[PDB]
Design a protein around this nucleic acid. Structure first.
Length: 54
RNA sequence: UUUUUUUUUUUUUUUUUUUUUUUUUUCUCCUCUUUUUUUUUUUU
């Protein structure tokens, strides 16, 4: 599944690929998807130093 | 000489029922005068 802002495909797939803001968006609410999560992996961790998105 | 990112129109449907017009009041109440009562009869 792809949860990009401008492309939404299979939002109920086993594997979801999304931008970072989506993860916090589904973490503010419950969304009952955190219960069946085994691995969550981040691809670019060097944005902790980002001045506006860190 | 002005880059990068910020998801979206609630889920559900394959439940049983053996009655019958109406419907429920109003009180006792001084009748004035020629009479017995005429009468057959025939033409419809």
């Amino acid at each position: 599944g792809l949860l990009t802002g401008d492309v939404q495909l299979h939002p109920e797939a086993s594997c979801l690929i999304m931008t970072t803001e989506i993860l916090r968006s589904m973490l503010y609410s419950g969304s009952d998807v955190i219960r069946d999560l085994e691995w969550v992996i981040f691809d670019e961790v060097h944005y902790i130093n980002d001045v506006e998105r860190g």
